[PDB]
């Protein structure tokens, strides 16, 4: 198990434009295209991302390319964020993946409300952090995924993903 296999489980793989859990146009392995309700706007973003006229359909290779870029961008974003970087640095590699997972799904702006959780994570108060993490829109809207991510933070193991 690793961050790539982990997000592949949580995000799935779809080669045609679909709507994510929030109703937003998405493709591949949870590559958000746009928050705009215009399908044409989404197709434009897709073409821009891939570098060709796709008309809403991409290959597995192209999906994986975007995915690698997105994971990279998420990690790079954490390290450039003065609030997130110290918490990230404080974590072991398994829990670091859980951090990347959240940033991937929510963006840094999504993680902004998680100040108290982040403090508990840096303190290594794993059970308390886990309780705090569940007190969120995130948990309520995507409970099965959040539960996996939270278990990863609580235990520092891949137990929530090993069976999947």
From Swiss-Prot:
Residues involved in substrate binding: 32, 104, 117, 132
Statement: the UniProt record of this protein carries the keyword Hydrolase: yes
InterPro entries: Endolysin_T4_type (IPR034690), Glyco_hydro_24 (IPR002196), Lysozyme-like_dom_sf (IPR023346), Lysozyme_dom_sf (IPR023347), Phage_lysozyme-like (IPR052619), T4-type_lysozyme (IPR001165)
Result, substituting residue 132 to I: 5-fold decrease in enzymatic activity
Upregulation: Expressed late in the viral replication.
Recorded consequence of changing residue 11 to A/F/H/M/N: Complete loss of enzymatic activity
Active site: 11, 20
Function: Endolysin with lysozyme activity that degrades host peptidoglycans and participates with the holin and spanin proteins in the sequential events which lead to the programmed host cell lysis releasing the mature viral particles. Once the holin has permeabilized the host cell membrane, the endolysin can reach the periplasm and break down the peptidoglycan layer.
The name this protein goes by in its record: Endolysin
The species this protein was found in: Enterobacteria phage T4
Classification of source organism: Viruses, Duplodnaviria, Heunggongvirae, Uroviricota, Caudoviricetes
Gene: E
């Amino acid at each position: 198990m690793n961050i790539f296999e982990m997000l592949r489980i949580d995000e799935g793989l779809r080669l045609k434009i679909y709507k994510d859990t929030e109703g937003y146009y998405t493709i591949g392995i949870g590559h958000l295209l746009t928050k705009s309700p215009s399908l044409n706007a989404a197709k434009s973003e897709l073409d821009k991302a891939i570098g060709r006229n796709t008309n809403g359909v991409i290959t597995k290779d192209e999906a994986e390319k975007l995915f690698n870029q997105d994971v990279d961008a998420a990690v790079r974003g954490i390290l450039r964020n003065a609030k997130l970087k110290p918490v990230y640095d404080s974590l072991d590699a398994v829990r670091r993946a859980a951090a990347i997972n959240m940033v991937f799904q929510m963006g840094e702006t999504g993680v902004a409300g998680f100040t108290n959780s982040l403090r508990m994570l840096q303190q290594k108060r794993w059970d308390e952090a886990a309780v705090n993490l569940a007190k969120s829109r995130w948990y309520n809207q995507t409970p099965n995924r959040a539960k996996r991510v939270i278990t990863t933070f609580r235990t520092g193991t891949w137990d929530a993903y090993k069976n999947l």
